[PDB]
Design a protein around this ligand. Structure first.
Ligand SMILES: NS(=O)(=O)c1ccc(O)c(NC(=O)NCCCCO)c1
Ligand SMILES: [Zn+2]
Length: 257
């Protein structure tokens, strides 16, 4: 099965998922001088006031905080998107060291981690249909740098002891994802893919310019999770990021100068 090790990591994925070598793969390096400011880009509309978090799950590759997506409760609109996209889950990718962990890079700079708020286009009816469409998902990507703590992340950090190993889940209600957002919603955007298998080319990526700061203790607690299931040999869940992929025939657009 695929993963992030020496024998099943990102350089192996194409053998089971040939789209790994496709034309719109993610993540990418964001060359800030080559991105083009698009003044027609609209401000992002993040409407998370009615969000209903349900549960947090260790799936063996990351942890997902899952939301009720059966109504328009937490939606992303505007920006480059047409229509309404519903929040289904968020998760992170992170490193073994503070100098690495993000999937996207900014002028080759790697951040300590990257948050992915995953949304699907309501015109396709459900997430499974949406991932089969070139405009099916919108993933809002937010970089994490190590510095001051992020208070809105702490409820996530504190529950991780309950989901240490693959397949463990915990109730996780009343979590407000607005506590994970930076001040500015300035963003870069480009067409891309899921960054884990099945690597489907269904994502409008929206990557925020401004990182959030989290404390060293917060990211340390991410690194105590396990890729393995309970009663299996312990592999720390670290470096669960795919490196930057070729940009090919794509232009990254910026909502700001
Ligand atoms: N990193 S991402 O581009 O924001 C991303 C957003 C939504 C996704 O569905 C995936 N891929 C995925 O879930 N693959 C199957 C493993 C889960 C079952 O345990 C990746
Ligand atoms: Zn992700």
């Amino acid at each position: 099965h695929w993963g992030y090790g020496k024998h099943n990591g990102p350089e192996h994925w194409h053998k089971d998922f040939p789209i790994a070598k496709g034309e719109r793969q993610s993540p990418v390096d964001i060359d800030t001088h080559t991105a083009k400011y698009d003044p027609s880009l609209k401000p992002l509309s993040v409407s998370y006031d009615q969000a209903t978090s349900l549960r947090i799950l260790n799936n063996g590759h990351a942890f997902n905080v899952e939301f009720d997506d059966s109504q328009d409760k937490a939606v992303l609109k505007g920006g480059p998107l047409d229509g309404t996209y519903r929040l289904i889950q968020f998760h992170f990718h992170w490193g073994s060291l503070d100098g690495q962990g993000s999937e996207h890079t900014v002028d080759k700079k790697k951040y300590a981690a990257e948050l992915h708020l995953v949304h699907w286009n309501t015109k396709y009816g459900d997430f499974g249909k949406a991932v089969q469409q070139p405009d099916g998902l919108a993933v809002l990507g937010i970089f994490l740098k190590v510095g001051s703590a992020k208070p809105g992340l702490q409820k996530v950090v504190d529950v991780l002891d309950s989901i240490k190993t693959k397949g463990k889940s915990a109730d996780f209600t009343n979590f407000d994802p607005r506590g994970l957002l930076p001040e500015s919603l300035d963003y870069w955007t480009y067409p891309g893919s899921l960054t884990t298998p099945p690597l489907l080319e269904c994502v409008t990526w929206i990557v925020l310019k401004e990182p959030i700061s989290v404390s060293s203790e917060q990211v340390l607690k991410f690194r105590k999770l396990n890729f393995n299931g309970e009663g299996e040999p312990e592999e720390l869940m670290v470096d669960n990021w795919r490196p930057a992929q070729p940009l090919k025939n794509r232009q990254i657009k910026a909502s700001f100068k």
